[model samples]
Target: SLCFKLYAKGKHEKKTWFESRDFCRALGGDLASINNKEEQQTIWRLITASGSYHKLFWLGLTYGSPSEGFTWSDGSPVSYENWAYGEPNNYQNVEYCGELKGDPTMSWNDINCEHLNNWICQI
Candidate 1:
């Protein structure tokens, strides 16, 4: 029996948020979702370990309609959030995708869905 969680880091090439998700889907998974502090830390550790401390990675989260707020693509509840200061600002009213910042904290941020960036997938 072999069962374990797997995370796929797409750090080599950059793609739009939508394209990132499609890539993950092609690989039999979806963008990684942070559900708790431990999970968040785990992903951050992987990012730092890979020497990607200054690269943004797309998450499965998106700013749904005003009534829906933010939601994960996997249909999980938005139980926990690690957004950086003043994030999800919807700057210029075009940001609708969620991404993990490459700063030391590896916190979360919202940006335009069309922007190109790395991504992480979980299976």
Candidate 2:
């Protein structure tokens, strides 16, 4: 069996965070949750292969509340993070969602949940 499979092929269009998640679910997948370096590498390869430039892709990570803090969508503990410098700082404190920032090493970053961008859905 294929170790990795992704949906939304050719779905280079942008969608809001929630909208992207919903679309992935509709296809039996979810916004990808990177758990290890291997997975991250696979995701990065796919992202780069998509022919996009410095695009942000939504992930299954979020800050539930201002004080409650963060969690993965599948309820997994955030054991590993690849945040870019000063990331997840909650810029303006409104940035609650996570994305794989495509440039400068494709590190993680906290972004507004309402912003639209290319997304990844994995199974």
Candidate 3:
């Protein structure tokens, strides 16, 4: 049983990945990290249920540089991946952060870390 406490905050609030990451840290948590499909769906449901009208929310996954590849914020190994079809493509070679897209029907996408969006945090 992989139990945990998760929160999708800033419903009407949005921020860049960096800022959002900081917000979670200040609250004694890190940005959400979906370890598997079940966790992914669980978090997605929470986001949609929160009434947030955003398409994407930052995840703890990120690629430090083009050559670095993606990894969880806490430096965990990549045990599960939910990237959308043909995604994490590093579009234009500039996308480096991960996001859960399409509300509760969430799938993952790699985007520019500087782009603004809502976020999830797990304590």
Candidate 4:
């Protein structure tokens, strides 16, 4: 028997990082955490299949300052990263949330947590 975990993509509504996590939490899961390349590819497929290409989406990852570094909302270790070139720049010193860039690369980037973006949840 095969059990499948659902990765729900919330394309209908955009939310801040906190709000996005809360929404997923209400559904009994948290924002998605991509642990490896395969998971990343699956998420990309889901995003494109949903016709949301070129649209940024929030992830579970976040930066907790320089000392604390980046951490996933699910408290998973940062074992795999797919950041685009020169990403996690913390531009304007305000970027603290992780997002999946909408480009073909589907790379990761750091952005302001308050910015509204679609999110994915794992359950």
Candidate 5:
């Protein structure tokens, strides 16, 4: 069987974080989640090709409340974190999602998933 590697292609348009997350999920995938430096590097290359210079993208990197804080859809702990310096500060105590900062670095930031941006997904 040809292993169909699922992917969520961007629409070349901006959507809030949540919209972007939901959009990708609707396609049977979720916002891109990097588990390590290599994956992060790969995505850095991919998302940068989208929107204009330094255009950000939504991600699945949230560390919210409920002691269930920082849990992934796969129910895995975020052992492999790679956030930019001073990020996911649980800003306003309303953080449960993440977005890829727009730049060649493609760092991470905490934000409402509803806060749209471009997105990527995989299965």
Candidate 6:
């Protein structure tokens, strides 16, 4: 079973993925890491479910080694993936990062990880 440990800083409160992940870590978990189709969809559902985190949503995907796939800032390789349209392009093989925004029709996009975004925690 998967669970989300959410911390509410309000609807407009914002922070970078680094900051958001740190905050979640302080709360006993890191930014959520989805590990499968179910978990992936679940996280997106959770985000849009709240009607918050509208601009961007933080995820645990980082190009720690570029040569390798996404890994957590905590040094954990991502266990699941669902890159959006033209995604993980590495955005020219440079943006080995992941952040998502729940677009219409329940879709999402991989955004600049450093960009401020809302987040979820997996516990």
lDDT of 4 by residue, 3-108 (tens): 1133335545668999988988887888888888887878777766767666777889998656767989988888898999999899998999999885568789
Can you write out model 3's per-residue Cα lDDT over 1-123, one digit (the tens) per residue?
A: 323343344546678888878887887777888877888777756655656556577888888654666788866666898788899798998898998884655789999998888677776
Return the candidate ranking by TM-score, descending.
1, 4, 2, 3, 6, 5
**lDDT against the true structure, each candidate:** 0.78, 0.74, 0.75, 0.79, 0.62, 0.63
Error of 2 at 73 (Å): 1.5
Off by over 4 Å in 2: 1-12, 65-68
TM-score of 5: 0.70
Worst 10 residues of 5 by lDDT: 1-10
Candidate with the greatest lDDT versus the true structure: 4
Q: Which one wins on TM-score?
A: 1
Instruction: Give the per-residue lDDT digits (tens) of candidate 1, residues 1-123.
Output: 111122334545678889988887887878887888877778767766766667777889998787878999878888898899898798999999999875667689999999888778786
* lDDT value for model 3: 0.75
User: How well does candidate 4 match the true structure, expressed as C-alpha RMSD?
Assistant: 3.3
> Which parts of model 1 are misplaced by more than 4 Å?
1-12
Model 5 stretches astray by more than 4 angstroms: 1-13, 48-52, 64-66, 74-76
Write the residue-wise lDDT of candidate 6 on 9-46 in tens digits: 55568777778877877877777776666766676567
lDDT of 5 at 27: 72
CA deviation > 4 Å runs, candidate 3: 1-12, 64-68
| Worst-scoring 10-residue span by lDDT in model 6 | 101-110
Mind giving the per-residue lDDT tens digits that candidate 5 earns over 40-87?
666666654543455566666656556655755434467677677998
Counting only residues 3 or more apart in sequence or on different chains, how many pairs clash (N, Cα, C under 3 Å) in candidate 2? 0
Q: Model 6 off-target regions past 4 Å?
A: 6-12, 53-55, 74-76, 92-96, 103-110
Quote model 3's TM-score: 0.79
State the lDDT at 72 in candidate 1: 91
Which 10 residues in a row give candidate 3 its minimum summed lDDT? 1-10
| Alpha-carbon shift of residue 24 in model 1 (angstroms) | 0.3
- RMSD (Å) of each candidate, 1 decimal: 3.4, 3.2, 3.2, 3.3, 4.3, 3.4
